[PDB]
Structure formats: structure tokens, C-alpha cells
């Protein structure tokens, strides 16, 4: 869905890529594409 550590989703950190998977940090309340 997104490149990496940029913008998993157009609003926060929520990737869509099936093979990939962001990382929930909580600091911002979301999961960034590590």
C-alpha cells in the first residue's frame, strides 16, 4: 500500500498490503510501515 515509514494510510498509520504489515507503536495510536 505505502512505501515505508511514510504514510501507511492517507490519515494515519494503517497499511493495506497483505504481504506487508506496519508496526503499532501507540505513540501516535497507529501502525507505521516499518
Curated annotation (Swiss-Prot):
One of its GO terms (cellular component) is extracellular space. Its main location: secreted. Residues 1-34 form the Agouti domain. One of its GO terms (molecular function) is type 4 melanocortin receptor binding. Widely expressed at low levels. Highly expressed in the skin. Expressed in adipose tissue. Keywords: Chromosomal rearrangement, Disulfide bond, Glycoprotein, Knottin, Obesity, Secreted, Signal. Disulfide bonds join 1-16, 8-22, 15-33, 24-31. The keyword Signal applies. GO terms for biological process: adult feeding behavior; cell-cell signaling; epigenetic programming in the zygotic pronuclei; generation of precursor metabolites and energy; hormone-mediated signaling pathway; melanin biosynthetic process; melanosome organization; melanosome transport. It is found in: Secreted. Involved in the regulation of melanogenesis. The binding of ASP to MC1R precludes alpha-MSH initiated signaling and thus blocks production of cAMP, leading to a down-regulation of eumelanogenesis (brown/black pigment) and thus increasing synthesis of pheomelanin (yellow/red pigment). In higher primates, agouti may affect the quality of hair pigmentation rather than its pattern of deposition. Could well play a role in neuroendocrine aspects of melanocortin action. May have some functional role in regulating the lipid metabolism with adipocytes. The presence of a 'disulfide through disulfide knot' structurally defines this protein as a knottin. It is linked to Obesity and hypopigmentation: An autosomal dominant disorder characterized by early-onset obesity, overgrowth, hyperinsulinemia, and hypopigmentation of the skin. Some affected individuals experience hyperphagia and exhibit reduced energy expenditure. This is Agouti-signaling protein. It comes from Homo sapiens. The lineage of its organism: Eukaryota, Metazoa, Chordata, Craniata, Vertebrata. The chain holds residues 93 to 126 of 132 of the full protein.
Amino acid at each position: 500500500c505505502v512505501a515505508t515509514r511514510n504514510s501507511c494510510k492517507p490519515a494515519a498509520a494503517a497499511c493495506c498490503d497483505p504481504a506487508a504489515s506496519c508496526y503499532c507503536r501507540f505513540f501516535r495510536s497507529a501502525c507505521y510501515c516499518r
